[PDB]
Structure formats: C-alpha cells, structure tokens
From a paper:
We demonstrated that the TCR from the 1E6 T cell clone bound to HLA-A*0201–ALWGPDPAAA using a limited footprint and very weak binding affinity. Here, we solved the structure of the 1E6 TCR with 7 altered peptide ligands (APLs) determined by our previously published combinatorial peptide library (CPL) screening, 2 of which mapped within human pathogens. Concomitant with our global analysis of 1E6 TCR binding to the APLs, we observed a common interaction element, consistent with our previous findings, that utilized TCR residues Tyr97α and Trp97β, forming an aromatic cap over a central GPD motif that was present in all of the APLs. Ligand engagement is dominated by peptide interactions, but hotspot-like interactions with the central GPD motif enable the 1E6 TCR to tolerate peptide residues that vary outside of this region, explaining how T cells expressing this TCR may cross-react with a large number of different peptides.
The low number of contacts between the 2 molecules most likely contributed to the weak binding affinity of the interaction. In order to examine the mechanism by which the 1E6 TCR engaged a wide range of peptides with divergent binding affinities, we solved the structure of the 1E6 TCR in complex with all 7 APLs used in Figure 2. For example, the 1E6 TCR made only 47 peptide contacts with A2-MVWGPDPLYV (KD = ~600 μM) compared with 63 and 57 contacts with A2-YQFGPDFPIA (KD = 7.4 μM) and A2-RQFGPDFPTI (KD = 0.5 μM), respectively. The stronger ligands all encoded larger side chains (Arg or Tyr) at peptide position 1, enabling interactions with 1E6 that were not present in the weaker APLs that lacked large side chains in this position. The range of Tm was between 49.4°C (RQFGPDWIVA) and 60.3°C (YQFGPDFPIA), with an average approximately 55°C, similar to our previous findings. Conversely, the stronger-affinity ligands A2-RQWGPDPAAV (KD = 7.8 μM), A2-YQFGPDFPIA (KD = 7.4 μM), and A2-RQFGPDFPTI (KD = 0.5 μM) exhibited favorable entropy (TΔS° = 2.2 to 14.9 kcal/mol), indicating an order-to-disorder change during binding, possibly through the expulsion of ordered water molecules. The unligated structures of A2-AQWGPDAAA, A2-RQWGPDPAAV, A2-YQFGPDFPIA, and A2-RQFGPDFPTI were virtually identical when in complex with 1E6.
Numbering used by the authors:
A (entry chain B): 0 to 99
B (entry chain E): 1 to 246
C (entry chain A): 1 to 276
D (entry chain D): 2 to 200
E (entry chain C): 1 to 10
Write the structure that this text describes.
C-alpha cells in the first residue's frame, strides 16, 4: 500500500504582535493514511486546548487538517508543531517562524 | 420462489400483552421494511433497516412499538402493551438496492393481528352446508352448494372446499368479505358464504364426497379461559354432504 | 465565476475496535457547510456554516439519514474490498468517495463527478459523460460490473445534472453574503539576506477569499519561475486564505524584481516591489 | 406527505376503460407507483415512473403531472380479474419510505351472455331446516341491496369461474329467521328482473 | 444536498 508523509506549515492567523491574542495554526496536508497525531507546543510543552478541522481530502486523495488554538505571542516564547504519522520513525517538530 | 417469511400468520390476543411479529427476509437481501395496514389509516411504513440498522423510523408509533434486527436474517417488531387500535395486517418486505432503484420490494404474506378488549367475545364458526333445490337443477341442469359459517368472532377464517380429499379451486366462489350478522354494535359476530358449482350428476351421483372446511383463528393454549363455553381456540370446524339422486 | 458543491466520505477500518471510523464533509466552493462523524455523540449531520442553519427539520433529517446510510455501505465495502484483495483482517484500510457538481458563472451545469478510492488510490470513477465507468484494476472491474447491472450511473447522472445543481444554486443565494463575497488579498513584502551574494524576497497575500490566487515573480517584466518558490495555499482559520511566494536574488538587484498578485477581489492585478 | 385518493368503490362493466388517480402536496416526491391488492393479500407493484410523464405496459398506462401534482393509472379493456384495490404510492430521494394513498376499490363486472335469473330454496344437511334463498345466474346489470332491521334480514353477492366447462355465473345468498321470511319476499330492496319457483 | 437515498455496495 501507498503511504504519503505529511507536509506541515506552522503560522499565525494574523500578523504576530507581541502581547496580542492571535491564533496559532498547524496545517498538515498531503498525507496518507489519515491517522495522525499533531500537538502545538509552547516552549516544548503541549498546549492542551487544541482544536482541529473535520477530516477532508484533496484531488489526489491525500488528507488535510488544520489544528489551531488561541495564543499570545511574546518575544521569548517558542511555539512549534509536532506531528507523528506512520511514515515517520519519530515525531517531526517544526518551529513557528513568525516571518513565515 | 421461496420468499419473505413472516410469523405468526394470525394472532388473536387480549389487550395488555406483548405482541411479537417476526420476519425473515429473502436470503441475500439487505433491506427490510415493516408496514402496517388498517381500515382507518390505509397502508403505512413503520420502519426500514439496511445492513441491520434502522434508517427511517419516522413512521413508528411514539411509544409502545419497537423494532430490532439482531442479524441479517431476522427482524422483530414488538408491541407492549398491545391495544385494540393496533389491530391491523402487518407486512414485512425485503429488497436490494438494484431492485429498490426500480421500486421493487418483496412482501411476506403478512400477519393479521386482532387485539381485543375482552376474549369473552371470541367464537368459532358454526358451519352449516345447504343442499341444491330441485327446481334450480330442474331448470338450469347444474347444482349449487352453499356453505354457511355463522356466529364467529373475530373475522379470521379461511374457507376451502375438498372433493375426495383434494382441495379444489375450479368452480368455487367465496364472499371476498364477511357479512356482519349485525346486532347494532361492533362486538358482533360474523357470517360468510361460499359456493361450489357442479356438473349434472356430480351432485346426483350418491357417491360424491364433498366438504366445506373452515379454519378459525382464536385463542391459543397459553390463553386463560374459564367460561362454561368450550374455549374458542384456533380450530377447523366443518360440514359436508353426499350426493342424493333419490 | 464558477461554483461547485462537493461531498467527501472517508471510512477507516479498525480491527479490534469493531466499527470503522466514518467521516463526511460537504463543501460549497472553498467553504465547509456540513459534517458527520460516526464516533461523535450527535449521530446527525451537523451544520458548519451559518447559511445552512436556516434549513428546516426535514432537510436535516434527510441529510442525516443519507449520510448514515452512506456509512453503512462504506463499512460493507471495507470488508468486500479486503476480500477482493485477499488482505489480512489485522490491517487498517481506507475507502474514500467524493462526488459533486460544478456550475459556470451563469450558474448552469458545467460538469458532475463521482469517484472512489481504496487505500488512497483511484479505484473506480464515473467518466465525464456520466454514463460510463473507469476501473483501475480487476477488483474495480467486479464493482463496475455490479454497478452497470444496477444502473447506478443513470441515478447519479439525474442527480448531478438536476438536484445537485439546483441545491448548489439555492445555497449560493441563501449564503450570498458568505459565498458570493470576495475578500481581496492584503499583500506585503519581506526581505532577508542569505548567501551574501544573495537575498530572499517573499511576497505575501493574506486574508483572501476565494482560495484561488496567482502569485508570480518577474525579473524586469519577465516571467521568473526560475528558483522561485510557492507554498501551498493555507487556511487562516477564519474563512480566509494565505499564500506566499519567494524568489532568491543577487543582492542589489532588489529593484529589478516585482511580485504580481492576481485575484478575483482585485479589479486590477497588483504589482509589488521591495520598498525601503 | 399526504396523498389523497378516492375510495370509490368503482363498479364498471367488463371491457371498460378505468381511470384511477391521486393528488399530493409535497413537491419533493419524485417516484410514483401503482399497486394492485387482492383482498386478504399483499400489494403487487404494477407500474413505476420517475417524475417524467407517461408510460405504457400492456393494458396499463401510468401518468404523472408534477405541476398539478396529479397522477393516474388507466386500465384498458378491463377484466373481472382486475377486481381489486388499487393503491398509489410515492417517495423522494432521501429515504425508501413510501407514502400511500388510501386506495380505490375496483369491481369489474363479468360479461355473462346467457343470463337466467333464478332464485330457489334449500335446507340443511341436518334434520333441522331453516332455509336459504339462492339467487343465482342473473347478469351483471342487477346491483343487490339487502335492507335490514336489527332483527334478521341477511344477504351477500359473488361470481364463480366454473372451469373445464367454459361457464361462469353470479350467485348471491339471503337468509333470516323471521319465520314469516319468504323467498318471494326476499330481495324487496333489490331491483331484480322477473322469476320465482316453488316446491 | 446529498445524492440518495443511498449507494450500492462495491
């Protein structure tokens, strides 16, 4: 059977401004099969309230999901997305780069 | 050829008890439908299932009615407690997507349910069998038998005619409906005729062996009864006559 | 512009868990409007856009019934296909179905579609004429022969050319505030040095709807798809979308580069140039 | 989801064209069907149409007009064996649930070329003899009424297909024990032709 | 509005 590993993008909903409430997004797409684990991290630690979109899929049948939570970006806090999926022998961590 | 099987064929029962109707769909069929049909409401869907799961139950009565499909070969519908207004013919049907696309489904023979207020109203038929008049065979060269089943309640009878120990079909005409031997009100026993017309000197042939057979559905052994009358159970009552040229 | 209504159905077998996980979603254009999940509490189709909330009780009962019926056939299918491929009962597999219709900007029928996949691969699909099937392998042939004998294609075609487009038109009207809006992209540029003979220019489009958008870089008015770089369009989460494109350029050539943004919200294509 | 249908009953002579119809109010119905039901039996599908006009099978024509929300079935050259209750049913595309009309009863009266309106009398196979009066062999022009008291005046009416002979006949039956109950007097609410026998 | 009432099995 065919497996496709997930593409991951981490980003804010609005332009980030230190001290202001925003949403942190982790978007995973291009993956198969659909079972997947995704966490949003704040200085290495799981954020517990995270919500996601309903499982859907693209023209090539690959799946995609948006994970997201409210957050207040600061100068020093590090935010990241962590994904695991059967195609990965260990979780993939992608740091939020607020210029991206 | 061997279609939807429903059970029981007939049920006559007292209000307040649990009624169970059963159905086995045609083998391989994966939809099953339960309908009812009465005088007052006509013909109506109660529920249907697909792959054993209920899809549409919008027609189910709001509380005494429950339907299950434990596996692909068996569905039940239960009424608890039963009430006189539940009296109806209940049909089960099954089908397959490709047949349902052309609006085809296959029906069982039905269960006829009478739920009565009081079993003391139940009576089996007295079956009297009349003889051809001389005139009618003097004038028309054929001879009419008349069978009369009277005083039976409720109306769950199935009449047949038998000649020399074979059920016959050709020649017979039974009323499509029972007559009410109507004392005014509804608690009222019923009567029914049938005829069997016969060729000249079949009736005169003293040898010829005839009987009006009438299956009554009434009480079952697990119904209580303590009238001095014989318990009006499900039974075959029946009359007869021989030829007479005399 | 053209519009589409599409439905997506996914089931995943779960050996040892009993019933498969079934998830269904409906979309008009890029906007989601219903969902169903076999494992959620409600056991009903649920609204996900405000304009579908105005549909009455009959609508929702109907949609709920169709989507549940759909989960049951997907569940049978997972067993049937497992058999067709002689696969172990220990593994988890996936069936996917998608169907839908498009309309032109006159809102008449353009096309309909209906496709099915097994473990993330094409399995069987209705061709564009809506009368014939393409099957990927001999398992799929067996399904094709069943569906041809059943005249499935004719039922689908009456739906896609009639009902689907009628209800699509209805949603576009009722949801015209959501669905017939365009939100023009908000654009800006970033600059970052790299290499030290080179810098990266990144052209940003945010907060736009619909998702459709065309970003390109030019070197002196010349199409520059040469080490340029486009992220996949990504949802902002508020109903809008986001996208950027990047070009890596020799430093002090910054002014030679322009970014061109095309989008339905833009009465005219925007040109951007590294400013300060 | 209410469908209106007239109960009749319809009584027509053999060879006649019959027209059955239903009206409905739910514009979402898209599949329209007709069933025949013989009495004490299940319904049998006759004809089915998707939205969409008119179709013909043998002596049958089904029609649908979705603007007037009116559907009909025509039966050419009606036969006695078409005697039955006729039920229309319909649904949409969201459920296999069928909504039925209340049904129309149809009687097609047989053509009986050699009528001979005979009554008679006859008594039981028992020592007892209350009697009956068999009105037999009349033609399918003569409707029968019984009238009644809550005291006894009791009667019915049916057709037999005497086969191997190529014959058929109407026979009816009346009885009571008003003891001043007479055959001559029997059927006095029933417009008969002329005839009467006697022992 | 979904196609219905339902689909045939594969």
């Amino acid at each position: 059977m065919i497996q496709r590993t997930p593409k991951i993008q981490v980003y804010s909903r609005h332009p980030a401004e230190n001290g202001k409430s925003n949403f942190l997004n982790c978007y995973v797409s291009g993956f198969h099969p659909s079972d997947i684990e995704v966490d949003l991290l704040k200085n290495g630690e799981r954020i517990e309230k995270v919500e996601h979109s309903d499982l859907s899929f693209s023209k090539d049948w690959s799946f995609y999901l948006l994970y997201y939570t409210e957050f207040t970006p600061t100068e020093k806090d590090e935010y990241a997305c962590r994904v695991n999926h059967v195609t990965l022998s260990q979780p993939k961590i992608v740091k939020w780069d607020r210029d991206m | 050829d061997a279609g939807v099987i429903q059970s029981p064929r007939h049920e006559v029962t007292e209000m307040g008890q649990q009624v169970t109707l059963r159905c086995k769909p045609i083998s391989g069929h994966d939809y099953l439908f339960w309908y009812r049909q009465t005088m007052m409401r006509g013909l109506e869907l109660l529920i249907y299932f697909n792959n054993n799961v209920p899809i549409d139950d919008s027609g189910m009565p709001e509380d005494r009615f429950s339907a299950k499909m434990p596996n692909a070969s068996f569905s039940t519908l239960k009424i608890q407690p039963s009430e006189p207004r539940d009296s109806a013919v209940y049909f089960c049907a099954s089908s397959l997507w490709e047949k349902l696309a052309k609006n085809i489904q296959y029906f069982g023979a039905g269960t006829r349910l009478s739920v009565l207020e009081d079993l003391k109203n139940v009576f089996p038929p007295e079956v009297a069998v009349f003889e051809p008049s001389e005139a009618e065979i003097s004038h028309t060269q054929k001879a009419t038998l008349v069978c009369l089943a009277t005083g039976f309640y409720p109306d769950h009878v199935e009449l047949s005619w038998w000649v020399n120990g074979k059920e016959v079909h050709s020649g017979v005409c039974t009323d499509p409906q029972p007559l009410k031997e109507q004392p005014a009100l509804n608690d009222s026993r019923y009567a029914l005729s049938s005829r069997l017309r016969v060729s000249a000197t079949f009736w005169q042939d003293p040898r010829n062996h005839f009987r009006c057979q009438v299956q009554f559905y009434g009480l079952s052994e697990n119904d209580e009864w303590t009238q001095d009358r014989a318990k009006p159970v499900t039974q075959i009552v029946s009359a007869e006559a021989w030829g007479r040229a005399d | 512009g053209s519009h589409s209504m599409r439905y997506f159905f996914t089931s995943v077998s779960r050996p040892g868990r009993g019933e498969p996980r079934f998830i269904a979603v409906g979309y008009v254009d890029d906007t989601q409007f219903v969902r169903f999940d076999s494992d959620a509490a409600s056991q009903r189709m649920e609204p996900r856009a405000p304009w579908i909330e105005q549909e009455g009780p009959e609508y929702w009962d109907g949609e709920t019934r169709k989507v549940k019926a759909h989960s049951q056939t997907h569940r049978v299918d997972l067993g049937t296909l497992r058999g067709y491929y002689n696969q172990s009962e220990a593994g988890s597999h996936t069936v996917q179905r998608m169907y839908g219709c498009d309309v032109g900007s006159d809102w008449r029928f353009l096309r309909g579609y209906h496709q099915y996949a097994y473990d993330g691969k094409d399995y069987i699909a209705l061709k564009e004429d809506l009368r014939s099937w393409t099957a990927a392998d001999m398992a799929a042939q067996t399904t094709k022969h069943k569906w041809e004998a059943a005249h499935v294609a004719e039922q689908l075609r009456a739906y896609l050319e009639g009902t689907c487009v009628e209800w699509l038109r209805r949603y576009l009207e009722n949801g015209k505030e959501t669905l017939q809006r365009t939100d023009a992209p908000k654009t800006h540029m970033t600059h970052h040095a790299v290499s030290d003979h080179e810098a990266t220019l990144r052209c940003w489009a945010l907060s736009f709807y619909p998702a459709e958008i065309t970003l390109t870089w030019q070197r002196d008015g010349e199409d520059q798809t040469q080490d340029t770089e486009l992220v996949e369009t990504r949802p902002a989460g508020d109903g809008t979308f986001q996208k950027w494109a990047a070009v890596v350029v020799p430093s002090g050539q910054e002014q030679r580069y322009t970014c061109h943004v095309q989008h339905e919200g833009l009465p005219k294509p925007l040109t951007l140039r590294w400013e300060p | 989801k209410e469908v209106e249908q007239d109960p009749g009953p319809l009584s027509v002579p053999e060879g006649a064209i019959v027209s059955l119809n239903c009206t409905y109010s739910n514009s979402a119905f898209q599949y329209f069907m007709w069933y025949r039901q013989y009495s004490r039996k299940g319904p049998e599908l006759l004809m089915y149409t998707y939205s969409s006009g008119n179709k013909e099978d043998g002596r049958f024509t089904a029609q649908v007009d979705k603007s007037s929300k009116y559907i009909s079935l025509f039966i050419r050259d009606s036969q006695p064996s078409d005697s039955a209750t006729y039920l229309c049913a319909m649904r949409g595309d969201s459920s296999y649930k069928l909504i039925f009309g209340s049904g129309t009863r149809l009687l097609v009266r047989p053509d009986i070329q050699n009528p001979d309106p005979a009554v008679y009398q006859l008594r039981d196979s028992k020592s007892s003899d209350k009697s009956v009066c068999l009105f037999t062999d009349f033609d399918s022009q003569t409707n029968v009424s019984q009238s009644k008291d809550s005291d006894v005046y009791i009667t019915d009416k049916c057709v037999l297909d005497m086969r191997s002979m190529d014959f058929k006949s109407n026979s009816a039956v009346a009885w009571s024990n008003k003891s001043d109950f007479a055959c001559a007097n029997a059927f006095n609410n029933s417009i008969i032709p002329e005839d009467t026998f006697f022992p | 509005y979904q196609f219905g009432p339902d689909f045939p099995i594969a």
